[PDB]
Design a protein around this nucleic acid. Structure first.
Lengths: 129, 53, 132, 185, 56, 67, 152, 70
RNA sequence: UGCGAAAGCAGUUGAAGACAAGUGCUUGUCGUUCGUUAUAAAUGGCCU
């Protein structure tokens, strides 16, 4: 359940966070590496932030927040940003996709997709018989 | 065990002692002795099972 | 029984004062009180009127030897508890308060009666022993 | 300042933070200088979920200002603590208290945060790792917390003993920070 | 017990002290009788719930 | 009269039976008193029960759509 | 390693801060301390549990005000152990009053589950049988009380 | 017409009265009335007869994160 | 809320102002006032 930040050039630990209550299965980061998002068995998504200029100068990450949005394990997570998009997409054993905003993760709204969207039909009915 | 004197306040003298135990003793410096025990690691007890070194 | 059921229905629609006499009629028997309560009491107004006349009658004489009126109250509470509490009339609450007060006294008496009933049981046995 | 609802002064005694109704707005001012002068509405700090929820989530019961003025802690009746970075108004939520938080106080460095409420438990939040150390079974709910010393040797607490409804029974407790034992009650 | 009181009632009347010598009986009976009002309340609740699911 | 607040009268009756004692009481009268008290006990139990009462998806479903 | 035997007999100052070792706490006590109301209830009804020790956890949860809280996330499968003990605890004079409080809540909190669950239903038929039996014993004890007052 | 969580019917001989979590779509993609949401989620919908509508609907352990209740 | 025993016996829970949301109207609120004896819910549980 620990998230650890290592220095690459020296291969040494900079920070350690004991955040999750169980396995952390996936990680993702934003384009500027201002946020690191983690998720795992405990169904929570944690945000680690280094946005403040003092944090950037010192190279220190902060455990900003977490959110419980999934009913079961979160196996996969990914992030995308553009001039018109900011997506944090997660899904897992619940079999449904959850969409958040990276910049406004803590206070933004989220959407839980339907488990089945029958774009391709798996059922037919015959009027006769 | 080792003496310690504050680099700023020269009057402050103290003795720190430790062993194969999960706590540490400090003796501020004769009817009685002022002894404090350090035993709290603030969430990092797993990384530290003895104060001996 | 069907006639006493139907006339009970009509008196209730007509807001008659003869409801009490209908409820006291000896033809009523234990399952039929359930069927009437389950099948015929469909409107809250009908339920409230039956509860009010019963609650009043028991309040004036909680020691009546007639077990029919209490029997109506017992099943009316058991089967329609939710709908009764759905009634928000203040006078209904006051009647419930009066009924509770009358029954509450009766509870306090039971330990004394059991004590007297215990003494009489000894007295009868000693009389029989003397006879033998 | 007008319509002051809540006010606090840093440990150094050189910064004053206060909240007014001019719903409400928080402003921080340096006392002896003009180095610090900030103001912002409470709505910016408050989360949207709070706006959806009851008033307990939007009602501040405690406030604390760092010596440097970089951080400000706000405590809410719901039990949630929010640390705001004054440079860019970035919020950070610390949630352990189940009931209203009554006392907040920063350490001199700003690396630790003393919090207390109805739980009768004093919590030292280590902000570097977000961890927390506890001092439970205190004699009363913690009205006030403070770090007292050049090196934070002592903690001064005010306890309430809310069992006695007839009177407010305050008890002043001075704890030795080294081993969290009552130096003077 | 019921026959002891029935038969030797005359003797038990003409004895200097009863409470000290029969303290065990008084305590034992008092314990049971005191539970009676609470037991009846449980009976009423059990009877009410039992009736509801039987008729349904 | 008793056979023909009431607790205070009944409690007063219980005192009488103690005052009357064991030997004095007569069998024929005791029978009528016994029948009376048995009736009261049953009534007392009935009212106590009332007093406590006062204190107290399918796989397939066919429905009509509202349009 | 030679100094362990020494007890400081020749020394100026002897300082002792070791806290005496307390008796190990049982599972139900640990759960109550950690605010595990539901798990504390489960530990009460386990095989080979002292009857008096089962009565305490029930009293503690009642004292803490956590009687409904301990009974929310339950179904017929995990309600029967409580009802099995209630079937036996009702007999004893000490645990009769506590059984009434807990059985009253479970009926008021699981009326709907009762109708659809057959196995629970028999647990109230036989429980109804026993409480009626206890009524007869408590009524009887009042009668021996009444006659005993007559002798004195 | 029907979707994953809604069903609609539109009469094409009657005109209608005139009276965040997706791409803003500034860029291009390339280079008489009845509405109900009571029925959801829907696998399939169709008519069996002229007055019969067939609506087909959907009917694991998880890490325990308790919900406080007092 | 008053009286009393613990049981209970009587009696209350009003108006104004301001704000928010939805659509001048509707609802909900009050670190606003006057008068009368007068559900909860930010995943959030206690050290060594």
């Amino acid at each position: 359940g620990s998230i650890k930040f290592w220095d690459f050039q020296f291969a040494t630990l900079n920070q350690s966070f004991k955040a999750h209550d169980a396995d952390v299965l996936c990680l993702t980061t934003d384009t500027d590496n201002n946020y690191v998002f983690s998720a795992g068995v405990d169904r929570k998504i944690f945000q680690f932030s280094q946005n403040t200029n003092k944090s950037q100068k010192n190279n220190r990450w902060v455990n900003s927040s977490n959110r419980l949005l999934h009913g079961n394990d979160i196996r996969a997570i990914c992030a995308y940003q553009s001039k018109g998009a900011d997506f944090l997409v997660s899904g897992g054993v619940e079999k449904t996709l959850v969409i958040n905003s990276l910049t406004s993760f803590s206070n933004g709204n989220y959407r839980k997709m339907p488990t089945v969207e029958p774009y391709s039909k798996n059922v037919l009915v015959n009027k006769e018989q | 065990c080792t003496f310690y004197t504050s680099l700023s306040n020269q009057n402050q003298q103290n003795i720190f002692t430790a062993g194969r135990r999960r706590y540490m003793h400090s003796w501020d410096l004769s009817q009685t002795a002022k002894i404090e025990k350090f035993s709290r690691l603030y969430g990092h007890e797993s990384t530290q099972r003895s104060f001996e070194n | 029984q069907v006639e006493i059921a139907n006339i009970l229905s009509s008196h209730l629609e007509a807001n008659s004062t003869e409801i009490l006499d209908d409820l006291m009629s000896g033809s009523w028997t234990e399952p039929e009180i359930k069927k009437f309560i389950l099948t015929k009491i469909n409107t809250v107004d009908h339920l409230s009127k039956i509860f009010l006349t019963i609650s009043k009658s028991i309040t004036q004489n909680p020691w009546n030897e007639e077990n029919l009126l209490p029997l109506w109250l017992k099943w009316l509470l058991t089967l329609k508890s939710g709908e009764l509490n759905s009634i928000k009339d203040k006078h209904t609450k006051k009647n419930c308060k009066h009924l509770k007060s009358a029954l509450r006294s009766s509870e306090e008496i039971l330990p004394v009666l059991l004590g007297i009933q215990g003494r009489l049981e000894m007295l009868r046995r000693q009389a029989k022993l003397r006879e033998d | 300042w007008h319509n002051v609802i809540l006010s606090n002064i840093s440990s150094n005694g050189k910064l004053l933070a206060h909240m007014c109704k001019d719903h409400k707005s928080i402003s921080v001012v340096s006392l002896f200088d003009d180095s610090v002068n900030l103001s912002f509405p409470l709505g910016s700090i408050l989360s949207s979920q709070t706006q959806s929820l009851s008033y307990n989530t939007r009602y501040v019961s405690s406030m604390a200002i760092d010596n440097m003025g970089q951080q400000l802690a706000v405590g809410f009746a719901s039990g949630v603590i929010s640390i705001v970075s004054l440079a860019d108004l970035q919020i950070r939520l610390l949630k352990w208290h189940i009931d209203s938080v009554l006392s907040l106080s920063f350490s001199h460095d700003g690396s630790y945060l003393l919090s207390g409420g109805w739980e009768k438990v004093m919590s030292l939040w280590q902000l570097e790792t977000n961890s927390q150390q506890f001092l439970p079974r205190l004699n009363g709910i913690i009205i006030d917390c403070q770090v007292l010393g050049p090196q934070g040797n002592y903690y001064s607490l005010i306890l309430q003993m809310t069992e006695n409804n007839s009177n407010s029974d305050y008890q002043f407790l001075l704890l030795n920070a080294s081993d969290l034992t009552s130096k003077l009650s | 017990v019921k026959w002891c009181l029935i038969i030797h009632g005359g003797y038990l009347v003409s004895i200097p002290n009863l409470m000290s010598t029969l303290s065990s009986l008084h305590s034992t009976l008092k314990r049971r009788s005191d539970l009676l009002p609470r037991l009846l309340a449980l009976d009423a609740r059990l009877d009410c719930t039992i009736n509801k699911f039987k008729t349904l | 009269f008793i056979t023909s607040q009431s607790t205070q009268l009944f409690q007063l009756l219980s005192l009488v039976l103690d005052s009357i004692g064991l030997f004095s009481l007569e069998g024929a009268l005791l029978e009528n008193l016994t029948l009376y008290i048995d009736k009261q006990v049953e009534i007392a139990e009935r009212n106590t029960e009332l007093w406590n009462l006062i204190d107290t998806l399918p796989t397939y479903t066919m429905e009509y759509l509202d349009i | 390693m030679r100094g362990s035997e020494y007890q400081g007999d020749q020394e100026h100052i002897i300082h002792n801060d070791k806290v005496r070792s307390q008796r190990r706490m049982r599972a139900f006590e640990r759960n109550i301390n950690q605010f595990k109301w539901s798990e504390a209830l489960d530990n009460a009804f386990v095989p080979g549990m002292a009857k008096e020790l089962t009565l305490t956890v029930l009293q503690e949860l009642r004292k803490r005000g956590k009687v409904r809280v301990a009974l929310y996330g339950r179904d017929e499968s995990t309600l029967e152990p409580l009802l099995n003990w209630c079937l036996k605890g009702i007999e004893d004079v000490r645990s009769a009053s506590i059984v009434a409080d807990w059985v009253a809540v479970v009926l008021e909190l699981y009326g709907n589950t009762l109708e659809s669950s057959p196995v629970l239903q028999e647990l109230m038929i036989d429980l109804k049988t026993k409480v009626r039996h206890e009524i007869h014993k408590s009524k009887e004890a009042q009668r021996i009380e009444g006659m005993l007052q007559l002798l004195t | 017409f029907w979707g994953a969580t809604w069903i609609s019917r539109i009469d094409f001989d009657v005109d209608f009265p005139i009276n965040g979590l997706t791409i803003t779509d500034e860029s291009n993609f390339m280079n008489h009335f009845f509405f109900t949401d009571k029925y959801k989620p829907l696998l399939f919908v169709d008519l069996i007869s002229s007055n019969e509508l067939a609506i087909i609907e959907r009917n694991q352990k998880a890490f325990i994160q308790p919900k406080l209740v007092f």
